[PDB]
Structures are given as C-alpha cells and as structure tokens.
C-alpha cells in the first residue's frame, strides 16, 4: 500500500496528503477490480475470543496513551498488563472512564459519513454501564434527551449502556432513533404518518402500544436490557421539543400542518472500542436542514409532500422540464430553516455545514494526517455542486473506534 | 461471486455477474475507496496480442459466431499482423462495435440508454490537420442537424510510436474563450483561460468577448498544431431567456447546442485512438448548474439572485438554491423553444434507471459511477440517488490522457 495519497480540490486547487489511511483496520467492500462506494451496507452467538481480543485492546490502549502524550510510560505499560490479565482471567475487560470518553469521541471523529464532525471533541459522554433494567435504560435516555435538547440550544451527547458479554445478554434500543413518528399502513394500501417507521410501529402495537393513529405520533421507546424481552415506555411529551413548519413568505404553508422534532438521536448503531462492543449507545447532535426538508419530507417513500406544495404554489406539474419538483423542494427547505431559527432550535443549513466540514477536513489533514470521508454521504441531497464538498476529492477508509451497523433486534432476539 | 444492488426507493434488487469479466483496476483496495477521486492512478507485440484476442473473441461472441470459421481466421489474421508490423488494423465492423461499446461501458455517463444509436465516422485515412478540420466540420454539421442532434464519433488514426499522435487540443470542439483580465478577474469562460492563451500565442486574434467561439487547434501525425475557424453557420447557439422573468434575456447569456468532447482516448483491443471527438446532446444541468454556477466557471449566481431581489446576507435563506433552479428552468425553456435537443435531469436519470434494468437483464450488469451519475442539483428527488451502483472497468473504453501541451515536443 502506498504511503502518501493525494486528494485535490478541483475548485480551489488545494492538494492534501493522506498518511492516516495506513492505520485503517476494517474492510470497505471495494476490491482492486470493483468499487462499492455507493452500496449502503457493503452471528449473535459469536463474541470475540481471547486471542482476537488481545491485539484489538493493545491497539486501542496504545492509541489512547499516544494521544495523552504518555506512550511507553509506566502508566501505559501497567494498563497494558492489567488489560491483558483481565482478558486472560475473564475473556473480556472494562474500559476506564477516560478511555470510554476518548473512544466515543473518536468513533465520531472516525465516522466517514458524518458532515458534522468539526464538533467531534465537544461530545458529552454519559456512562450508563451500571444499568441493569429497561426502566433504568428509560431513565438514562430521558436524562439524555433533556440534556441534549437544552430548551433548543442543543448539545451533542451519547449514552453508553453495558457492553456485550456472551451475545445472549445484549442491551438494545429497538428504536432506530429515540424520537421518531409512527407510520400506519391502511387497508386500502395508503400510509398515515411516516412510511419509514411502519414495521417498527407494528412491532410496538403488537407489544401493547395503543396508537393514537395520527400523522405525527411520537413512538414509544422499546428497550431491551441484559438480553431480556424489550419493554415499552412513553417519553414524557414535555421532553420532546417540536417545531411547527411555516414559510417566511407563503402564509398558506402553515396550513399544511407540518412539524418536526428538534433532536436527531440515532439509537440502533453499535459502538466498537478496543474490540469491545456497545450494542446500545444512542447519540444525538442537531439537524442539517436537508435531513428534514429534502429526505424526511420529499422522499417518495417518506412524507412525500412535493406534490401538495407544488399545487399550493400553482406550478405547472405536467412536464418535468418546468422543474416544479426542484422549485418546491427549495421552498420546503427554506421553510424548515426559517421555522427552526424562529423558535431558536439549533439547525445548520447545508452551505454552512459543508463549508465547516472542508475547514475541518483541512485541519485533520494537517494535525492527524488525514480525514476519512464518504463523498456519497457528505454531499447534501440537494444543490450538490454549489456546496464546496462536491468539488473535494475524499478518501474513504475505516478507522477504529467506530460506529457500525448491526442487525435489527427483532430479527435476532430469542423470545423468553 | 454474484453481487446484488438494491434500489432503496423501489426495493428492486438486481444481480451483477458482468463485473466478473473486468480485468482493469479501479484504484480502490479492500482498505481504501477512491470512488470520489477524479483520476485514480505505447504497447508491445506481447502486450498487444492477448488484448486483441480478447476483443476479437467478444466481438465474435456478440455476433453469435464464437469459434466460427471467420472467428478463427480473424484471430490468425490478427496474429500475423502484430508479428510483422507491431500493431494491427480493425475491420470497419469491429471499429463500430468497439466505439459503441466504449460508450456502453462508460460508467460515468447517464446518457447510455442511447449507446447503440451512434454514428461512427472512420477517419483513419487522415494525414494532415487540414484533413482533420474537414472531418470535424462534417461531424459538427451531421451531429447538429439543425437542432435535431444526433450522436456521433469521429475516429482518427491510432497511436503508432507515440511520436506521431493525432490530437485535438481543444477539450471540446465548441467552447468559449476565457481571458485573464488586467484587474485580476476573468472574462469569458475561466475553464479555458489556459487554452485561450495558447491559441492567442499561436496567432489567434481574440475578439475579447463573453462568448467567443474558440478556434480548433489540431495536431496530425505528431506535427505542431494548426488553427482553424469553424464556419459560424455550423455553430448552433441558444440565447437563454426565462419563461416568466422577462429581465432574464437582458443578462446577455447564451450557450452552444452541441457538446463534443475531444480530449479523451478511445481504447479498442489494445489499440489507442488519441483523437476521437464524440458528441451527443446536453443534459440541462451541465450548462445551468456546472457551466454557469461553478465558482470557477461563469459564476452567475450573485447576478441572477440580485435581479430576483433575494435576501443574500444569510446562506440559510437558500438564495443560491433559488437562483440555481431559475437558471436551469431558463436553459431548458430556451433550448426547447428553439427546438434544440436537450434533456432535463429528471427525464435523463429516469431513462438511466430503465437502461440499468435493460443491461442487467440482457448483459448481467451495468457499470455505473454514482458520484458522476447523480446530477449536481436536486440529487435525492431523482431516482438514481436511491439506486445502488457497482463501478468497474470494462473494455473497449474511453480513458483520460495528458493535455498535449505538456507532452508535445515542438519543432
Ligand atoms: C452535531 C451535529 C451533527 C450534524 C450536523 C451531523 C450531520 C450528519 C448528517 C447530515 C449525516 C447524514 C445523515 C443522513 O443522511 O441521514 C450524518 C451521519 C452520521 N453522523 Fe453526524 N451529525 C452530527 C452529530 C453527530 C454525532 C454527535 C455523532 C456520534 C457521536 C454522529 C455520528 C454520525 C454517524 C455514525 C453517521 C453515519 C450514519 C450512518 O452511516 O447510517 N453525528 N451526520
Ligand atoms: C446522447 C446524449 C448524452 C447525454 C445526455 C450524456 C450525458 C452525460 C453527462 C451529463 C455526463 C457527465 C458530464 C459532466 O458532469 O460534466 C456524461 C459523461 C460521459 N459521457 Fe455521456 N452523454 C451523452 C452521450 C454520450 C456519447 C455519444 C458518448 C461517447 C460516444 C458519451 C460518453 C461519455 C463519457 C466517456 C463520459 C465520461 C467523461 C469522463 O469520464 O470524464 N456520452 N454524459
Ligand atoms: C447524530 C446525527 C445527527 C444528524 N443531524 N443526523 C444523523 C443521521 C444519522 C443517520 C443517517 C442515516 C442512517 O441510515 C439510513 C438508512 C440506512 C439503511 C436503510 C435505510 N436508511 C442512519 C442509520 N442509523 C443514521 C445518524 C446520526 C445523526
Ligand atoms: C458526450 C457527452 C454528452 C454530454 N451531454 N456531456 C458530456 C460530458 C463529458 C465530460 C464531462 C466532464 C469531464 O471532465 C471534467 C474535467 C476533468 C479533468 C479536469 C477538469 N475537468 C469530461 C472529460 N473530458 C467529459 C463528456 C461527454 C459528454
Ligand atoms: C444508493 C445510495 O447509496 C443511497 O441512496 C445513499 C446515497 N447517499 C446518502 N447520503 C446521505 N447523507 N444519506 C443517505 O441516506 C444516503 N443514501
Ligand atoms: C471531487 C469529485 O469527484 C468531482 O467534483 C466530481 C464529482 N461528481 C461529478 N459528477 C459529474 N457528473 N461531473 C463532474 O465533473 C463531477 N465532478
Ligand atoms: Zn471504492
């Protein structure tokens, strides 16, 4: 593998040099003869063996002591020996609080698909490894929601529940995000609410949830502790900050009855640190406007509102070459940013966010020797080429600590 | 192994077997993906015969006569020729097959539903830049067809020793000049400031306007390049106006109807065709987003947003996004009103999805570069954004080559 790789920005001519790729530890899915860079995702009994765990832990511990400028120190060699004994006697080990915080921040720093990583070192880490029950998980999650929401001055945070042991005692949040809206398939084939969440909604209903059957119903939490069957909990509604969507010019936009929640909090990913696996680790930041205004609202398989907005805008919808879809899409994203800013709920537009990411990427190249980035995900879903990331070459590779995908828990759970 | 690609909007899953036929590299490895790198980085008789044999085999497999008498005789024929000349010449049928398949295999091209409808002009008998100019004029006239554009490619003689290359020095046959001003800024098209200066330095008298059609700069058989003015009645242009903003025409904008890329290399069966201008018709965003609104291109967003009286102090007003849509409405409206072929990015990406379906069914796959296929605006409200794609390299192909003014040893 070549030692220095160059990436160029075709708009500014800036050339950056990447050496950090030499530290990559996992597979991308690509080969020498095929590129899988647009593939979205390129056994539960199996946990890391002693022999697998030793090198992964040393690699992380080494990285941690190098970061605090104590590599090779007495404290470094003693921590190595203590970890090695734990793995020897118990087949696993426990991270120190300092290492847990370092690992979580670096999984975010390493998340190649995240345009928001300029913030990676300002992450509030909540240590929930003492949790034993689903009620306890509910408590930790409510506190997380309240802290991160901060009455609209959102603060990035992660809550980390106990790590995997034998694979039969996993902690899991069954929700894909802490706050999402229910979706309901009707007998006639139409959908009320968010079509993305129909399957999960049906699971909640089977578990006993009584659905209000509206368009914007906050879903309950479905929480699994220690491998037990999951349990339902209603998030207290005063903890769910929401924004009604209105438009600065179009007085009729409010009459569409749209709203969205303030806190994006992904809850179905796995955090890997030093070979340890944290299967329940909900983390939250704040929104980029297009996540709501382009994807959530205008995806055909989501709320799919382009049609109705175009009608109320009295656009010619007969020919595609009028660009009526594009024109309505901009107005919708204007409304989303206006409504969040008016209510003083943190949000970032796609111009500001991508401009910050370029500055972040350049700094990471300077101080760290690189910045893994997934162009397919970094470039926003509208107006791609009038953001600076479109013209920026990126290298994608997988560093650890990392956030990973994991199978949906209803597909693997053994019901008690 | 068989590879699956999913459309996350329609849940259609296609199965790729065609990738198993590739042997050229992508630039990625198991540990690093270079899918967003623009260019991830003179044969011998021994390099040349396996390449020739592979291409002959796939041609005779394509015409349902694999292992036939003609197939066996063509292989032996090509064998003797590489032996005794260090190269070989393609039959006419093979030239046409190879050129259509280079287009078919172009992973970055969203227009490939048209790939088998390509007019192939054989220019392998050309010897001088005057001959190149004649062949190119005939291409332009045929492809333009009074607005009813027709896809075409003109293929000049192949590389021999690398010292006698035919080259079109222009990056496209029709482009507008760019002028580096005294006060530091740029008049015209900044993409072409360097090429324009080379044309001036070679004797071209520049009109110094905003849309000055560049001359052709043509190199035959490795000689110094020579300048030629394309006859203006051959250059079809469209004044851009808006269907609702009557002030838009006062911007003074125009563009040319014929996109004709002239700086790429065509590779067929180990042979290299360093001059092979090819042309189709525009997707509107190529003009309305990239050519007009790239920071390093015509950069007209501020001006348009001014005349729209948009609030420009905060990025979160999305004033850039509003002006961008209006510019692209004007381009599509202007070409359509003048009956010049153009396709919008919704229709084009929709056609590409259908093309992918066809290729998976009849060919076992379709190499496709998501980074290039997804249009530069309104990405996720086009169907290709939600379509998983596999990128891999098949030959015959179009390849990049160095700019001639970095190689050419003058005399
Ligand atoms: C603080 C403000 C943040 C912003 C503006 C932001 C922005 C984004 C956006 C726009 C995406 C693409 C999402 C999509 O297309 O649906 C994304 C993905 C991602 N973000 Fe960030 N993010 C933020 C905070 C965080 C935090 C706090 C973490 C973890 C601690 C994180 C980790 C990730 C990961 C792992 C992904 C990839 C998700 C996947 O592959 O499915 N982000 N982010
Ligand atoms: C007929 C209508 C066609 C349409 C609408 C079309 C559309 C496009 C577009 C939009 C691009 C991306 C260009 C950019 O972003 O700057 C592209 C790339 C490309 N097209 Fe097509 N195209 C057409 C015809 C053709 C033909 C006739 C050929 C060759 C015979 C061809 C070969 C290519 C190649 C090689 C590329 C990639 C260029 C590169 O890698 O730098 N296309 N096409
Ligand atoms: C912290 C934060 C802030 C912010 N503003 N946005 C964020 C977006 C994500 C995010 C996006 C897309 C995802 O996957 C879509 C998918 C996958 C497979 C199939 C269908 N769809 C997932 C999967 N967990 C997460 C994660 C964290 C974010
Ligand atoms: C046949 C046809 C029809 C149509 N409608 N559009 C077409 C666009 C291209 C096309 C686009 C971008 C390109 O690369 C930009 C670049 C590279 C390196 C450095 C700077 N810039 C090249 C490389 N020549 C070609 C090619 C053919 C087209
Ligand atoms: C097929 C394609 O990979 C898929 O639609 C991806 C494209 N890029 C994306 N980019 C972001 N940020 N989020 C997404 O969900 C997707 N979806
Ligand atoms: C850095 C990146 O590869 C570069 O900007 C690419 C991105 N995608 C593109 N897509 C198209 N269609 N045309 C382009 O010129 C580019 N440029
Ligand atoms: Zn790749």
Swiss-Prot record, chain A:
Location within or outside the cell: Cell membrane, Sarcolemma; Cell projection, Dendritic spine
Residues annotated to bind heme b: 114, 405
Tissue expression from the record: Isoform 1 is ubiquitously expressed: detected in skeletal muscle and brain, also in testis, lung and kidney, and at low levels in heart, adrenal gland and retina. Not detected in the platelets. Isoform 3 is expressed only in testis. Isoform 4 is detected in testis, skeletal muscle, lung, and kidney, at low levels in the brain, but not in the heart and adrenal gland.
Entry superkingdom: Eukaryota
Residues bound to (6R)-L-erythro-5,6,7,8-tetrahydrobiopterin: 38, 376-377, 390
PTM (free text): Ubiquitinated; mediated by STUB1/CHIP in the presence of Hsp70 and Hsp40 (in vitro).
Positions with a binding annotation for L-arginine: 177, 286-287, 291
Domain comment, as recorded: The PDZ domain participates in protein-protein interaction, and is responsible for targeting nNos to synaptic membranes. Mediates interaction with VAC14.
Family according to the record: Belongs to the NOS family.
Self-association state and partner proteins as the record states: Homodimer. Interacts with DLG4; the interaction possibly being prevented by the association between NOS1 and CAPON. Forms a ternary complex with CAPON and RASD1. Forms a ternary complex with CAPON and SYN1. Interacts with ZDHHC23. Interacts with NOSIP; which may impair its synaptic location. Interacts with HTR4. Interacts with SLC6A4. Interacts with VAC14. Interacts (via N-terminal domain) with DLG4 (via N-terminal tandem pair of PDZ domains). Interacts with SLC6A4.
Biological role stated in the UniProt entry: Produces nitric oxide (NO) which is a messenger molecule with diverse functions throughout the body. In the brain and peripheral nervous system, NO displays many properties of a neurotransmitter. Probably has nitrosylase activity and mediates cysteine S-nitrosylation of cytoplasmic target proteins such SRR.
This protein's name: Nitric oxide synthase 1
Gene for this chain: NOS1
